[PDB]
Design a protein around this motif. Structure first.
Motif, short mmCIF file in Angstrom:
data_model
loop_
_atom_site.label_atom_id
_atom_site.label_comp_id
_atom_site.label_asym_id
_atom_site.label_seq_id
_atom_site.Cartn_x
_atom_site.Cartn_y
_atom_site.Cartn_z
N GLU A 1 1.04 -1.18 -0.01
CA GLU A 1 -0.02 0.11 -0.01
C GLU A 1 0.92 1.27 0.25
OE1 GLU A 1 -2.45 0.83 3.65
OE2 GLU A 1 -4.03 0.89 2.15
N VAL A 2 0.49 2.28 -1.00
CA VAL A 2 1.55 3.45 -1.02
C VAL A 2 0.49 4.76 -0.90
CG1 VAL A 2 3.05 4.51 -2.71
CG2 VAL A 2 2.79 2.01 -2.95
N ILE A 3 1.14 5.64 -0.17
CA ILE A 3 0.50 6.93 0.18
C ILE A 3 0.96 7.87 -1.32
CG2 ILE A 3 0.19 8.88 1.65
CD1 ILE A 3 0.75 6.96 3.99
N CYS A 4 -0.38 8.45 -1.79
CA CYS A 4 -0.02 9.03 -3.00
C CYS A 4 -0.10 10.54 -2.68
CB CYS A 4 -1.04 8.63 -3.94
SG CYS A 4 -0.54 6.85 -4.53
N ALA A 5 -0.23 10.99 -1.54
CA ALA A 5 -0.38 12.44 -1.21
C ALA A 5 0.71 13.48 -2.17
CB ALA A 5 -0.49 12.89 0.12
N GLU A 6 2.02 13.03 -1.90
CA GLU A 6 2.99 13.91 -2.50
C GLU A 6 3.22 13.49 -4.06
OE1 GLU A 6 4.59 16.05 -0.96
OE2 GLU A 6 3.70 15.78 0.70
N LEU A 7 2.62 12.49 -4.42
CA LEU A 7 2.78 12.20 -5.98
C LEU A 7 1.51 13.01 -6.59
CD1 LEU A 7 3.64 9.90 -7.97
CD2 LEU A 7 1.18 8.87 -7.72
N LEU A 8 0.36 13.37 -5.87
CA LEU A 8 -0.63 14.16 -6.73
C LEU A 8 0.03 15.50 -6.43
CD1 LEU A 8 -3.76 12.43 -5.76
CD2 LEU A 8 -2.35 11.92 -7.65
N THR B 1 4.72 7.98 -11.77
CA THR B 1 5.12 6.39 -11.03
C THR B 1 6.10 5.58 -12.18
OG1 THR B 1 2.71 6.36 -10.35
CG2 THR B 1 3.80 4.16 -10.62
N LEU B 2 5.71 5.71 -13.38
CA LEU B 2 6.61 4.93 -14.32
C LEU B 2 8.06 5.72 -14.22
CD1 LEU B 2 4.87 4.71 -17.90
CD2 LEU B 2 4.93 3.02 -15.84
N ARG B 3 8.29 6.89 -14.14
CA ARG B 3 9.64 7.59 -13.77
C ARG B 3 10.45 6.93 -12.45
NH1 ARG B 3 13.87 7.79 -13.63
NH2 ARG B 3 15.67 9.21 -13.89
N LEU B 4 9.47 6.72 -11.43
CA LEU B 4 10.28 6.39 -10.08
C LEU B 4 10.44 4.74 -10.16
CD1 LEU B 4 7.91 8.46 -7.69
CD2 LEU B 4 10.24 8.82 -8.48
N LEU B 5 9.49 4.27 -10.92
CA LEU B 5 9.61 2.59 -11.32
C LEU B 5 11.09 2.53 -12.05
CD1 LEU B 5 8.89 -0.40 -11.76
CD2 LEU B 5 7.54 0.42 -13.81
N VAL B 6 11.40 3.47 -12.90
CA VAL B 6 12.66 3.44 -13.59
C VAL B 6 13.81 3.30 -12.70
CG1 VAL B 6 14.20 4.48 -15.32
CG2 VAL B 6 11.63 3.92 -15.71
N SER C 1 7.87 9.83 -1.04
CA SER C 1 8.45 11.18 -0.89
C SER C 1 9.37 11.39 -2.06
CB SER C 1 9.74 10.75 0.34
OG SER C 1 8.89 10.70 1.27
N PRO C 2 8.74 11.87 -3.36
CA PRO C 2 9.49 11.84 -4.58
C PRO C 2 10.72 12.65 -4.40
CG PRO C 2 7.12 12.18 -4.84
CD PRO C 2 7.54 12.28 -3.33
N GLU C 3 11.01 13.59 -3.73
CA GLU C 3 12.48 14.57 -3.47
C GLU C 3 13.52 13.31 -3.10
OE1 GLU C 3 9.58 14.80 -1.70
OE2 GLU C 3 9.99 14.73 0.47
N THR C 4 13.37 12.20 -2.55
CA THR C 4 14.24 11.35 -2.24
C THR C 4 14.77 10.47 -3.57
OG1 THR C 4 12.65 9.44 -1.70
CG2 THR C 4 13.43 10.92 -0.02
N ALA C 5 14.27 10.72 -4.67
CA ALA C 5 14.77 10.35 -5.88
C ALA C 5 15.94 10.94 -6.46
CB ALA C 5 13.72 10.54 -7.09
N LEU C 6 16.18 12.23 -5.64
CA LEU C 6 17.33 12.94 -6.24
C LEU C 6 18.57 12.43 -5.68
CD1 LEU C 6 16.06 16.58 -5.63
CD2 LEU C 6 16.37 15.49 -7.76
N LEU C 7 18.62 11.62 -4.71
CA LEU C 7 19.60 10.99 -4.24
C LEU C 7 21.00 10.54 -5.26
CD1 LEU C 7 21.23 9.73 -1.84
CD2 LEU C 7 19.84 7.79 -1.82
#
Lengths: 224, 224, 224, 224
Positions: free
Chosen positions: A31-38, A57-62, A216-222
């Motif tokens: 289960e995934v919380i989508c508040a920050e995604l939207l 979602t696809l970009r983060l899946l990559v 937390s999409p900002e964590t993708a910057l790591l």
């Protein structure tokens, strides 16, 4: 009422039969919380409306596939062939049935580029203009049945891939945050995997990493 | 402790084996709010107590099948044979094992008639008086494992049908209504389908229509 | 200011005179809460806006007539002829006067079909294109004077029918619900009946059943 | 579906036709608060349960007729014959249709006696044991359609009587008491009268006196 099976429908049936007889599957869901995604989708509406929750979602899946390479692979009769290219297949519902267009070299596309290619492929699927190259060669597939209203689902692996990811419907649901019951947009992700190739620890690491990126999409910057 | 497999048990095993080897299945689930379903059952207790939440769910399923005809069909080795008659099989747990009685021509029965036939078939299953005609010929099957306490489940398609619907347990669960977390009786419906016959868009349209009918039964009057 | 009586006006006067001299009438009225009726109309606006509160009232009237067959009948000079077909006449105000178009075989029409036929007949009445067949043969008539602002009324039976139903204006009025005075949309229904054919117990059973259907439309599913 | 008219039904039709052709009727209605009427019925449950709200209404009607003698009369072809005896007819719904038993010399019966005779007549109507004397000779008739659920109604005068009183359903309705909107059990009384015999001032005096007696039954003691 007899309906002979032809073209797009016939292709779907042959592919489903092949996957069914060959692959011992298992499933894992998170289960995934989508508040920050939207909220991130809302930030991009003005400059790049093609960047939908599905494209994000696809970009983060990559990113998750880059760090969990065994999920983008094939069982070869025995060896596992791990693919360096991430060619992302995704279901596109059309008037003639299901088409599964493929984003080739998705690992080399940034968010805007990936969202633009997804939009082009959806347009091509709807207008019947996709070439045979645009409908083959995927290494991982996504089924966004959530966009159709399905809360959770179990799709069929696109043979000879090792896994498929199902994306449940994003809508407000109750969750516990900081000990309190609150409403959040959420979705259930379900990974159906070839258990000869991927084990439970590998699928769990992959799904937890993808959940954490979406939450937390900002964590993708790591590592970007 | 060796137990030879005979009669009702043997029939179940042969049917399960045939379905398993032949059908490439996929699953889709939707969460359904059951507050209005139970209130309607309460309204009918005095005049027609045979009209249970299960009988009401079956009546609304018959409407959804009328508008989603591909769900009531068979793959024929290739063609899809869409059946005009809706012969509803349903699981009935007995002391000797699982029987799957069939409501023939369910499309022609009103709520009271359907509930009465279901009650007769359950009585016959329990007393061992069902004829062979009453145990064959279904075009769609329902598994009410929710009545046994199961929250969600994945039943096996009754070969050569294209789909089976599993009905999870109805009980109070948290949901979001108008932005607020509230308690409601709910159930999870799970459709297991032959992906050679039915695609994800078709199953999603069917499940969303059935969810909406259950959530607001008065909307069933549109085409009645 | 002398106005010779011709065409539509002359037909109305001849019909009113015949009904007056022949039928010993009585009247019964019931107050009906219309909150659920209007909520159901709101649910159908998107898919079928032809389904108005009037069309929904007529659909529920057809159910009540199926269970109270003596209301759809004729006194024959003595015998009562009970009609199996429900041919519903309804008043349509036009620039030339009152026309009473007839929905033939209303018992065989579902809500959407009945609402569509009513809309066609209203269009035909306004444009002066109704055929003589569309203006005769009714077995029961409805007068929706409520749409014109009348709170309650007593219409004239359409000879040789046994009854006419008047529908008062739907608007917010005070009623007692659960011991509390509250505001609800309501309407008064008035049945004017030939007391040679229908007695008070028969009219009361019919009106109470129709009130209960309007107040909780989902209860119409019992025998549908 | 032809139903020849015989016995009880035939008697009803002949009586309705005679009343219709001969009597120029008018109607007057009053709303009556029934809180004290029901409280008095509750006081009598233990000793005399035959004293229902209907029997109490009839007893108070007998007082009102004693003080408004023109309501208990007949037009004779011209003279008005005012009857000293009050022979009260009342509608009793049976399986064979409407019977109108008559309480002879109701003016000489106390509450308990009147309620006992009404109960005997209802039993006789249901069992088919009433004699011809018990079904004729009324001078005033009451139609309790309220017991059948009708909120208000217009019954047919029992020829050759000058008036009939219809009793609407007793149920909670909003009324203004001391400037405040409150809930009270109420009923609408409707008097249908032969306007050749009784004028509006006479019917209004009668209905207001009867309303005031029902609203405060202890005021009946004034001349008892």
């Amino acid at each position: 009422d007899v309906r002979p099976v032809h073209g797009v429908h016939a292709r779907m049936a042959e592919k489903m039969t092949l996957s069914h007889k060959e692959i011992p599957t298992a499933k894992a869901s998170v289960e995934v919380i989508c508040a920050e995604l939207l909220r991130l989708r809302d930030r991009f509406v003005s400059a790049a409306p093609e960047i939908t929750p599905f494209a994000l979602t696809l970009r983060l899946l990559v990113i998750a596939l880059k760090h969990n390479v065994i999920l983008n692979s094939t069982w070869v009769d025995p060896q596992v062939h791990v693919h360096r290219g991430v060619h992302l297949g995704f279901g596109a519902a059309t008037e003639r049935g299901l088409l599964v267009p493929v984003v080739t070299d998705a690992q080399d596309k940034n968010t805007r580029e990936l969202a633009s290619r997804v939009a082009e492929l959806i347009t091509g699927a709807r207008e019947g203009t996709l070439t045979p190259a645009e409908l083959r060669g995927s290494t991982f597939t996504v089924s966004n049945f959530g966009a159709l209203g399905v809360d959770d689902g179990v799709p069929v692996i696109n043979h000879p891939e090792a896994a498929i990811l199902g994306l449940g419907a994003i809508k407000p649901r109750p969750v516990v945050v900081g000990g309190e019951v609150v409403a959040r947009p959420t979705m259930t992700l379900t990974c159906v995997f070839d258990h000869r190739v991927v084990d439970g620890a590998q699928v769990a690491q992959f799904m937890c990493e993808l959940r954490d990126l979406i939450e937390s999409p900002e964590t993708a910057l790591l590592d970007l």
